[PDB]
Design an enzyme around this catalytic site. Sequence first.
Site, PDB file in Angstrom:
ATOM      1  N   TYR A  48     -27.860 -15.665  37.173  1.00  0.00           N
ATOM      2  CA  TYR A  48     -26.884 -15.480  38.237  1.00  0.00           C
ATOM      3  C   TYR A  48     -27.357 -14.478  39.291  1.00  0.00           C
ATOM      4  CZ  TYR A  48     -24.150 -17.389  34.313  1.00  0.00           C
ATOM      5  OH  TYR A  48     -23.690 -18.145  33.240  1.00  0.00           O
ATOM      6  N   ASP A 154     -26.291  -6.829  24.975  1.00  0.00           N
ATOM      7  CA  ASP A 154     -27.408  -7.697  25.276  1.00  0.00           C
ATOM      8  C   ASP A 154     -28.694  -6.890  25.199  1.00  0.00           C
ATOM      9  OD1 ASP A 154     -28.688 -10.167  25.933  1.00  0.00           O
ATOM     10  OD2 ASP A 154     -28.249  -9.979  28.055  1.00  0.00           O
TER      11      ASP A 154
HETATM   12  C1  LIG Z   1     -31.548 -13.905  30.727  1.00  0.00           C
HETATM   13  O1  LIG Z   1     -31.820 -12.524  30.358  1.00  0.00           O
HETATM   14  C2  LIG Z   1     -32.278 -14.233  32.086  1.00  0.00           C
HETATM   15  C3  LIG Z   1     -31.685 -13.459  33.321  1.00  0.00           C
HETATM   16  C4  LIG Z   1     -32.239 -12.021  33.503  1.00  0.00           C
HETATM   17  C5  LIG Z   1     -32.832 -11.708  34.888  1.00  0.00           C
HETATM   18  C6  LIG Z   1     -33.845 -10.513  34.817  1.00  0.00           C
HETATM   19  C7  LIG Z   1     -34.709 -10.227  36.114  1.00  0.00           C
HETATM   20  C8  LIG Z   1     -35.359  -8.788  36.096  1.00  0.00           C
HETATM   21  N1  LIG Z   1     -34.361  -7.749  36.483  1.00  0.00           N
HETATM   22  C9  LIG Z   1     -33.064  -7.941  36.468  1.00  0.00           C
HETATM   23  N2  LIG Z   1     -32.424  -6.835  36.895  1.00  0.00           N
HETATM   24  C10 LIG Z   1     -33.379  -5.896  37.224  1.00  0.00           C
HETATM   25  C11 LIG Z   1     -33.296  -4.574  37.721  1.00  0.00           C
HETATM   26  I1  LIG Z   1     -31.428  -3.815  38.262  1.00  0.00           I
HETATM   27  C12 LIG Z   1     -34.422  -3.791  37.978  1.00  0.00           C
HETATM   28  I2  LIG Z   1     -34.230  -1.824  38.700  1.00  0.00           I
HETATM   29  C13 LIG Z   1     -35.667  -4.386  37.733  1.00  0.00           C
HETATM   30  I3  LIG Z   1     -37.415  -3.285  38.074  1.00  0.00           I
HETATM   31  C14 LIG Z   1     -35.771  -5.682  37.250  1.00  0.00           C
HETATM   32  I4  LIG Z   1     -37.738  -6.547  36.981  1.00  0.00           I
HETATM   33  C15 LIG Z   1     -34.593  -6.461  36.987  1.00  0.00           C
END
Ligand SMILES: *C(=O)CCCCCCCn1cnc2c(I)c(I)c(I)c(I)c21
EC number: 2.7.11.1
Lengths: 327, 7, 7, 7
Positions: A48, A154
């Site tokens: 999402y 999670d």
């Molecule tokens: C199921 O876990 C799939 C969806 C998860 C998407 C993760 C992408 C990486 N991500 C997501 N949020 C983040 C942050 I806020 C930060 I600060 C960073 I660096 C990262 I790479 C992130």
Amino acid sequence: GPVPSRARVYTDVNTHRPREYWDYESHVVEWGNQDDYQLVRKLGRGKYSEVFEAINITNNEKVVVKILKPVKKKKIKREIKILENLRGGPNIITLADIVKDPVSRTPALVFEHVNNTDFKQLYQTLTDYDIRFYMYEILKALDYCHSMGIMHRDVKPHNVMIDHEHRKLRLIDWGLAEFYHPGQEYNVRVASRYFKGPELLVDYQMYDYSLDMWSLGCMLASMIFRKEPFFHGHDNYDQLVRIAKVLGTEDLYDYIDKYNIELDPRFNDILGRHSRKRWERFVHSENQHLVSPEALDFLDKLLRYDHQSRLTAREAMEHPYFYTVVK
Amino acid sequence: XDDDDDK
Amino acid sequence: XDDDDDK
Amino acid sequence: XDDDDDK
Ligand SMILES: *C(=O)CCCCCCCn1cnc2c(I)c(I)c(I)c(I)c21
Ligand SMILES: *C(=O)CCCCCCCn1cnc2c(I)c(I)c(I)c(I)c21
Ligand SMILES: *C(=O)CCCCCCCn1cnc2c(I)c(I)c(I)c(I)c21
Ligand code: NA
């Protein structure tokens, strides 16, 4: 019906707060100015979300922008409120701003930036001491969010950003987190399959902060044994079979009986009978430099079927496994 | 993300 | 499981 | 962008 349960720690935090602390559906968002930010480079995609490195062009600060895809506003407010309630806690990712495009109305969350290591590079290089250090840093974040009445739900490697060059860790992805209210029955369709606690797999809904401690134990076992994920199920039923082939069925059925849990008869049929396997059996030439008696004793005290019998995060921080880090 | 929300 | 015998 | 990536 199942026997009820209450958390052993921080049981009543949310009744010791104003209602608006946890009643996130009433939260009034403080919106900043989207024109303050420009994207720099894409970091990743969520189910999402789209995640970018960005810059605040008013003051040159490097940040991360998490652009949110259409989900229920209710879920967005829950994640905002939790991030605001936890802001400042040790190793909790810091929410810097919340913005929205005035035309498309797409919202975005703005966070401090982290330069996360490839988790493949990361595994090759971590020493025994490093695992203990980072495990303690995760425990600091979990004790903090539990102490503020929130369960993360999670915990898994993808949600633990480690910048190993900077020895820096952040717990991220608070989109599944929830407020703990004692007696409440929660959705068991949370966490990722490999990190789901037994309570989720047997549909025991009155769970608490100790779910996160099961997940943490799954992470610890994968790191010290160099087996990722440690419990590798094909589906949610197989996931409990994989757990039962390590922890054994005797203790699983003791847990089910203690809480008057009802399993599908066919689920009971496939679980069978499995002896407990001692943690020493997972030590091999390639992982023995990460294993010690203290590590196995610590692991054994996280990976318990009975959620009440697991270490709390605060108890975990007192374990001899961490003596080399803190004293 | 194996899952999404709470109820 | 596919039958309801609940209490 | 648009399309869904996987592996
Ligand atoms: C199921 O876990 C799939 C969806 C998860 C998407 C993760 C992408 C990486 N991500 C997501 N949020 C983040 C942050 I806020 C930060 I600060 C960073 I660096 C990262 I790479 C992130
Ligand atoms: C009510 O139908 C819940 C479903 C019961 C679980 C069956 C899952 C699929 N399945 C069927 N037989 C299985 C065996 I034998 C084994 I071992 C495994 I692992 C699984 I997944 C099975
Ligand atoms: C394609 O793979 C990812 C989706 C494209 C995301 C960029 C959308 C347009 N855009 C450019 N800068 C933006 C900011 I700064 C913000 I805050 C937002 I909301 C959006 I929409 C932006
Ligand atoms: Na030391």
